[PDB]
RNA sequence: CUGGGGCGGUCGCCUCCUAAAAGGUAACGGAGGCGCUCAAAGGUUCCCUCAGAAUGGUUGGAAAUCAUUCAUAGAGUGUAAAGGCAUAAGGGAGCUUGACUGCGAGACCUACAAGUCGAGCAGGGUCGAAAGACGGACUUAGUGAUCCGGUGGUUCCGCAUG
RNA sequence: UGGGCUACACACGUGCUACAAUGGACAAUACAAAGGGCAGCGAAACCGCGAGGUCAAGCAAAUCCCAUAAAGUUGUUCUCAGUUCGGAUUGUAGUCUGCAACUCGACUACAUGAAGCUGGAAUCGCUAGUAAUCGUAGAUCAGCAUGCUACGGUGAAUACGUUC
């Protein structure tokens, strides 16, 4: 809770094409352009990833 | 904090009709993620760990604790003092924003098969995964990060013996 | 980007990463930029215009980020022409005797 | 697993520390503290006898309201206060139990001080 | 000094053992240390508890670090050893200077000189909400008389007086 | 058939390209000689940024083709920096030859741009169309030379003298 040391996080809204399992964060301070209401209505600067579009394991 | 109702899902309608608890307070609950680093013997890395401590930061963000050495052991050069380590402990809605997050980027960036482990408990419910840091900043690309690295992610439940743990982790995740 | 000023366009961006006497064809076809344009060019409005075909190019430093990868997927699949990094070794199959100096 | 420790049995640790070099003698007799997670207890005993002197508690029937934790130990304080008015009301040792002096523990302190007791 | 003397060695303090369940007790008996160090390693108020063992975990030396469970102290305690100690005397943090002045009833030790411990009393502080705690370091070594000389104070003397 | 003769922390020979503004980059515009071409040389057209692909035009050749030599000259440029000096080395084109280019070829295409500012002691070549430079041919050869062998273009300086 500590002021001063900490880095910037916020709900960043994973904006993947594939179901957008949006429940990330980390230092993503970029373009706040479009924010699902169901998401964290903050940045969806996480464009594209490989996360849950094809598991190796659940395939 | 919104796929925390994952856990809160799971603790009544697998855990209850997996081993049939007598009560909803004894299912096994996660407390803490350590993310601890390790060592990355600085005789010339203190400058390193000055990069170590800010990537850590970009992992989670929590600044950690560089915890220093301990004994005077030689064939290895360090005092007590001599900061030879870093660690976060996640306990509140920080570990499940790094929990659900992580879970879902580990397995593809490893570009593994299975991924992890069957078992990598220690007969008492703590799991210890390892990372050789193929997974992390997946934010800002690799830009103005300098030296490869390995973490450790260990993950510390009130689990019991071996199989209450690994129902916990049948939750997203990959065994 | 990171262009220095004070000299003809047709060599001020080859100064990044990505550009070697394109900018004398490939830039010059997008913009209707001219030849003798020093420091003194009120290249403002003319900065969007080339930002629109920079914009399709890999140049500007991130080229060297796939740069940097095919050659950590090269050695990781651990070919002939990937050992030939890891080991000073010149790669394209050359004489690795005296006059090979360059790869150490 | 990990095991979650009590906060009774640490607090008793520190509480045996802090009570080696604290006594009351009749004169100068010991009020100590026992809050738990609703209720401050406060209470004074002399310790030579091992005879306590007043009692005071948050869930009594004088003082039992749900005003904030901190005015319940307020109301503790004056309480046990006025009751060692009727016998002893010369110094006496604060007692903090093993808990720090702050919060509720200080306001049981606060107000036993601006309500006749000399500590 | 000396199991003649010489040669060698030793000479002052500290710690054990010899020491015979108080103290004390010799040998050219058996073991070792000291001729300091610290402005925090002192004061005080707060918190805190170790080594080791398994176990399993990007560094993986066996053994750095992380987590769990056992851990009575096996750790640590400026420095030899012996007594101590988790009241922590060990480990952190915050404020600070009591690493004060004048004393001291009483006691230990002892041939003398010396040496040691002190409640308490003022004075004036520091820390703490307070009670209180503070006249140096967990304790026990880290030194050397008198005479002479230097230096700074000093309501003292200073030769007939100043 | 598959490797190897192509390996390398290195050490000497022999050459190539350079470390530039008596140059570099782009436009124009000249002038040769020698030799080859038995399905080989393959024009002029096209289609490709280019390496090059598709057919016929000619011919077993003083005529047809390789083949527009290049340096030069003319003009515009950069301004004296490891800069428009050069281009080594690495990923992108898959061009062509060939059962097949990974060991282990040949170019060009956009990238990347490293050593290198004329070299110490020493040492070598050379007396006129010669040193120096510039490009073109052929033999080998399916493909492949910075080598070799022949070819022309431009072309200095210097020899008082025999004592070392
Ligand atoms: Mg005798
Ligand atoms: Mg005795
Ligand atoms: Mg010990
Ligand atoms: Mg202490």
Redesign the interface.
């Given at each position: 809770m500590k002021q001063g040391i900490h880095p910037e996080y916020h709900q960043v809204i994973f904006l993947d094409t594939t179901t957008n399992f949006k429940f990330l964060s980390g230092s993503t301070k970029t373009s706040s352009e479009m924010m699902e209401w169901e998401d964290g209505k903050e940045y969806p600067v996480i464009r594209l990833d490989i996360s849950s579009d094809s598991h190796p394991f659940y395939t | 904090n919104?796929?925390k109702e994952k856990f809160n899902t799971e603790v009544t309608e697998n855990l209850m009709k997996k081993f049939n608890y007598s009560s909803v307070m004894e299912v096994p609950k996660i407390?803490?993620i350590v993310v601890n680093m390790g060592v990355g013997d600085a005789v010339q890395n203190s400058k390193v760990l000055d990069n170590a401590v800010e990537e850590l930061?970009?992992?989670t963000?929590?600044?950690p604790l560089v915890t220093k050495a301990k004994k005077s052991i030689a064939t290895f050069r360090l005092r007590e003092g001599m900061p030879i380590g870093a660690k976060v402990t996640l306990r509140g809605e920080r570990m499940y924003?790094?929990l659900?997050?992580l879970i879902?980027?580990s397995?593809?960036?490893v570009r593994?098969?299975?991924?992890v482990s069957k078992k990598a408990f220690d007969g008492?419910?703590?799991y210890t995964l390892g990372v050789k840091e193929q997974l992390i900043?997946?934010?800002?690309?690799?830009?103005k990060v300098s030296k490869v690295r390995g973490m450790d992610i260990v993950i510390?439940?009130?689990?019991?013996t071996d199989e209450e743990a690994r129902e916990l982790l049948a939750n997203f995740g990959?065994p | 980007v990171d262009i220095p000023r004070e000299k003809r366009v047709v060599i001020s961006l080859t100064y990044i990463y990505g550009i070697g006497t394109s900018t004398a064809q490939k830039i010059l076809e997008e913009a209707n930029v001219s030849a003798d344009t020093r420091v003194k060019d009120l290249t403002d409005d003319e900065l969007g215009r080339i930002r629109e075909v920079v914009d399709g190019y890999k140049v500007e430093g991130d080229l060297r980020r796939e740069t940097n990868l095919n050659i950590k997927r090269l050695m990781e699949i651990s070919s002939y022409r990937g050992i030939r990094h890891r080991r000073g070794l010149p790669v394209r199959g050359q004489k690795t005797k005296n006059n090979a100096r360059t790869r150490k | 697993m990990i095991s979650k420790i009590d906060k009774n049995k640490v607090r008793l640790k520190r509480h045996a520390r802090v009570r080696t070099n604290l006594s009351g003698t009749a004169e100068k007799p010991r009020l100590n503290v026992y809050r738990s997670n609703k209720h401050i207890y406060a209470q004074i005993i002399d310790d030579n006898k091992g005879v306590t002197l007043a009692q005071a508690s948050s869930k009594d029937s004088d003082i039992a309201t749900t005003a904030t934790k901190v005015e319940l130990a307020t109301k503790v304080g004056e309480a046990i206060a006025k009751k060692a008015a009727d016998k002893g009301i010369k110094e006496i040792v604060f007692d903090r139990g093993g808990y720090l002096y702050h919060g509720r523990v200080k306001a049981l302190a606060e107000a036993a001080r601006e309500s006749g007791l000399e500590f």
């Open positions: - | 919104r796929l407390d803490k930061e970009l992992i963000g929590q600044k924003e790094f659900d997050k879902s980027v397995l593809p960036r593994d098969f299975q991924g008492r419910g703590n900043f997946p934010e800002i690309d690799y830009d510390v439940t009130t689990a019991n990959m | - | -």
